[PDB]
Design an enzyme around this catalytic site. Structure first.
Site, PDB file in Angstrom:
ATOM      1  N   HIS A  41      -8.867  -6.276  -8.800  1.00 25.03           N
ATOM      2  CA  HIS A  41      -7.673  -5.476  -9.069  1.00 25.03           C
ATOM      3  C   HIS A  41      -6.373  -6.243  -8.849  1.00 25.03           C
ATOM      4  O   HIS A  41      -5.315  -5.803  -9.302  1.00 25.03           O
ATOM      5  CB  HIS A  41      -7.661  -4.205  -8.207  1.00 25.03           C
ATOM      6  CG  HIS A  41      -6.767  -3.125  -8.743  1.00 25.03           C
ATOM      7  ND1 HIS A  41      -5.429  -3.020  -8.420  1.00 25.03           N
ATOM      8  CD2 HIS A  41      -7.023  -2.097  -9.591  1.00 25.03           C
ATOM      9  CE1 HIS A  41      -4.902  -1.979  -9.035  1.00 25.03           C
ATOM     10  NE2 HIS A  41      -5.852  -1.403  -9.758  1.00 25.03           N
ATOM     11  N   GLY A 143      -1.896  -2.085   0.811  1.00 24.95           N
ATOM     12  CA  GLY A 143      -1.994  -3.509   1.044  1.00 24.95           C
ATOM     13  C   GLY A 143      -3.200  -3.914   1.863  1.00 24.95           C
ATOM     14  O   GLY A 143      -3.352  -5.090   2.169  1.00 24.95           O
ATOM     15  N   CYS A 145      -6.258  -3.543   0.921  1.00 24.07           N
ATOM     16  CA  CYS A 145      -7.418  -3.940   0.208  1.00 24.07           C
ATOM     17  C   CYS A 145      -7.777  -5.540   0.076  1.00 24.07           C
ATOM     18  O   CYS A 145      -7.093  -6.332  -0.582  1.00 24.07           O
ATOM     19  CB  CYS A 145      -7.357  -3.239  -1.155  1.00 24.07           C
ATOM     20  SG  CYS A 145      -7.553  -1.471  -0.853  1.00 24.07           S
TER      21      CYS A 145
HETATM   22  C1  LIG Z   1      -9.085  -2.399  -5.869  1.00 19.50           C
HETATM   23  C2  LIG Z   1      -7.667  -1.887  -5.563  1.00 19.50           C
HETATM   24  C3  LIG Z   1      -7.232  -0.627  -5.949  1.00 19.50           C
HETATM   25  C4  LIG Z   1      -5.926  -0.171  -5.709  1.00 19.50           C
HETATM   26  S1  LIG Z   1      -5.430   1.431  -6.196  1.00 19.50           S
HETATM   27  O1  LIG Z   1      -4.558   1.271  -7.430  1.00 19.50           O
HETATM   28  O2  LIG Z   1      -4.488   1.876  -5.075  1.00 19.50           O
HETATM   29  C5  LIG Z   1      -6.619   2.710  -6.453  1.00 19.50           C
HETATM   30  C6  LIG Z   1      -7.774   2.508  -7.217  1.00 19.50           C
HETATM   31  N1  LIG Z   1      -8.081   1.306  -7.699  1.00 19.50           N
HETATM   32  O3  LIG Z   1      -9.116   0.531  -7.086  1.00 19.50           O
HETATM   33  O4  LIG Z   1      -7.347   0.792  -8.812  1.00 19.50           O
HETATM   34  C7  LIG Z   1      -8.671   3.543  -7.492  1.00 19.50           C
HETATM   35  C8  LIG Z   1      -8.443   4.824  -6.997  1.00 19.50           C
HETATM   36  C9  LIG Z   1      -9.440   5.961  -7.289  1.00 19.50           C
HETATM   37  F1  LIG Z   1      -9.540   6.214  -8.613  1.00 19.50           F
HETATM   38  F2  LIG Z   1     -10.654   5.608  -6.843  1.00 19.50           F
HETATM   39  F3  LIG Z   1      -9.066   7.069  -6.633  1.00 19.50           F
HETATM   40  C10 LIG Z   1      -7.308   5.036  -6.219  1.00 19.50           C
HETATM   41  C11 LIG Z   1      -6.410   4.001  -5.946  1.00 19.50           C
HETATM   42  N2  LIG Z   1      -5.352   4.273  -5.174  1.00 19.50           N
HETATM   43  O5  LIG Z   1      -5.515   4.397  -3.753  1.00 19.50           O
HETATM   44  O6  LIG Z   1      -4.063   4.453  -5.773  1.00 19.50           O
HETATM   45  C12 LIG Z   1      -5.074  -1.062  -5.077  1.00 19.50           C
HETATM   46 CL1  LIG Z   1      -3.649  -0.451  -5.129  1.00 19.50          CL
HETATM   47  C13 LIG Z   1      -5.490  -2.313  -4.688  1.00 19.50           C
HETATM   48  C14 LIG Z   1      -6.779  -2.732  -4.890  1.00 19.50           C
HETATM   49 CL2  LIG Z   1      -7.300  -4.260  -4.296  1.00 19.50          CL
END
Ligand SMILES: Cc1cc(S(=O)(=O)c2c([N+](=O)[O-])cc(C(F)(F)F)cc2[N+](=O)[O-])c(Cl)cc1Cl
Ligand SMILES: Cc1cc(S(=O)(=O)c2c([N+](=O)[O-])cc(C(F)(F)F)cc2[N+](=O)[O-])c(Cl)cc1Cl
EC number: 3.4.19.12
Lengths: 306, 306
Positions: A41, A143, A145
């Protein structure tokens, strides 16, 4: 004496945490030998997260698209590939602090330590169980992740989790260190939600054995039960069915305390139907399910307080 | 989101743990620069612990009476002194892994991380609060003494606890890193017991603010209270009296959530008199008192889920 959710000492993992930047996005990576692991991501932009095609987004990057920082030192990326939902960045320096390690895919019910990290800097450490519904009840902010989950076995770090997302109920989801998600989740913005969860029966029983090892017997009773009769109660209270495998696993704890597994099950059944009547068990007013049989044997004395 | 008892990452302390042996007794020591710190009880024999005279026991030792092991390396003791209930052993090697550090004496109510250690080897890490009665509810087995408690402030490790004893109720007692006991305890076998304890009011209030920051408001109410009226309820339920200093400390959390401290106190009073009516707060069925205002600000988001 005492009984606490204990994490593994985190130093061996601390020396592996780095910062990975692509474009405007920064998160954490894991640096082992000459490879940095991080969530793929990192290559999405603020308008890419609905339906990003990672194969398409990645082909458009070069090695110098990626900035990797280890402390104040900048590592140079000399290679990159995608493995499931992770990126693997080859760097021109091998991590001198690489511990002995392996990658393992943990099973539901099993526990591990999380080193929560921001901008490549470790922030805190805590113990988590992989829920039956394949989520963890972690503590994570924006942050975090790329923060990892691990167990330590002598000098060997068994990495088992890398953090990727927060679900709508505030629980967390991620992958093993091969980039395969635990659970049916995907790394894109969808309507995905945690499925219904259940209590980890084997761990509650483990913890009742820990309480007896630590000297407390108040909740025991004069009854026994069959697996089947127990399981009828279990489904009523949203507990995992108990299996013969689980009974076998509780053998050592059963031997140390002299309490038959099915007799401890009779105690649990009574606790479930009657409640705890204002009493605590190992300090807790509720039945705890985030300690495995392994966790109890690791932390508790090998001689019980009879 | 989420909320867990989080320890500090333990690597900086792991690199300081050594093993100290005198006679037949082995325990843990803390190696900073060219000094090893450990409990002076290491010089007692199996018949000395009732009324040992440490001044008398120590004069009878030489530098080579002490065996200090750092990993597989043997450090040579070139000096020794007693400081209150600790020994200070000078060694011929300065610890290359010494972090920036200081020694601090923590106040009751305050929290820290414990690195549980056996034979100089870190075993686990967990978060503890210094109880008002100057004990900690740790998790410790034989040979854990000399394990230390700490907080980390940027790169600086503030050491605040060294473990010495288990009391009859299974709770734990020790000293600061100047060898002065927390509480009225002494390092000899007596009839000493933990005094009565009380709930840490300021920490419960902190945690209620954390719950609101994390999005939960169910326990709030339309009332307010005066300090004095609150304190009448507090003593009924064995809570610390709330002081104006405690109200002042809750200022930042009060500002972030828009809830007046005395209005949160009215909520607590209601929780105390009415119970939680089958509900949880941050996953808990009970009022938690081992998180400080500082702990909440460290772990929680700076923007609340309104
Ligand atoms: C792998 C990853 C995901 C996100 S995310 O944008 O924040 C995210 C994702 N995601 O993985 O793309 C999926 C979901 C959900 F669909 F599973 F709910 C929810 C979020 N979120 O907390 O905004 C972020 Cl910022 C940073 C990473 Cl490293
Ligand atoms: C400092 C120290 C104390 C003990 S102790 O023998 O175990 C001990 C002490 N003690 O400190 O001498 C005091 C008490 C009590 F009096 F406070 F209850 C209880 C114990 N105990 O757990 O057997 C041990 Cl082994 C090792 C160390 Cl490093």
């Amino acid at each position: 004496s005492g009984f606490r959710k204990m994490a593994f000492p985190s130093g061996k993992v601390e020396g592996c945490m780095v910062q990975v930047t692509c474009g405007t996005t920064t998160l954490n990576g894991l640096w082992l030998d000459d490879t940095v692991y991080c969530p793929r991501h990192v290559i999405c932009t603020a308008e890419d997260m609905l339906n990003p095609n990672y194969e398409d987004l990645l082909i458009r990057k070069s090695n110098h698209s990626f900035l990797v920082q280890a402390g104040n030192v900048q590592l140079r990326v000399i290679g990159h590939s995608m493995q499931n939902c992770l990126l693997r960045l080859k760097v021109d320096t091998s991590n001198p602090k690489t511990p002995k390690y392996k990658f393992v895919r943990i099973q539901p019910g099993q526990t591990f330590s999380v080193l929560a990290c921001y901008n490549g800097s470790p922030s805190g450490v805590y113990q988590c169980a992989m829920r039956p519904n394949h989520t963890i009840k972690g503590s994570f902010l924006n942050g975090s992740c790329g923060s990892v989950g691990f167990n330590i076995d002598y000098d060997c770090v068994s990495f088992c989790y890398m953090h990727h997302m927060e679900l709508p109920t505030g629980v967390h989801a991620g992958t093993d260190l091969e980039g395969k998600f635990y659970g049916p989740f995907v790394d894109r913005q969808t309507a995905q939600a945690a499925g219904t969860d259940t209590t980890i029966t084997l761990n509650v029983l483990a913890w009742l054995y820990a309480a007896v090892i630590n000297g407390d017997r108040w909740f025991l009773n004069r009854f026994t039960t069959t697996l089947n009769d127990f399981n009828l109660v279990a489904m009523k209270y949203n507990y995992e069915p108990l299996t013969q495998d689980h009974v076998d696993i509780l053998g050592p704890l059963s031997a140390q305390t002299g309490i038959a597994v099915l007799d401890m099950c009779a105690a649990l059944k009574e606790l479930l139907q009657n409640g705890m009547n204002g009493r605590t068990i190992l300090g807790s007013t509720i039945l705890e399910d985030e300690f495995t049989p392994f966790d109890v044997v690791r932390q508790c004395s090998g001689v019980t307080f009879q």
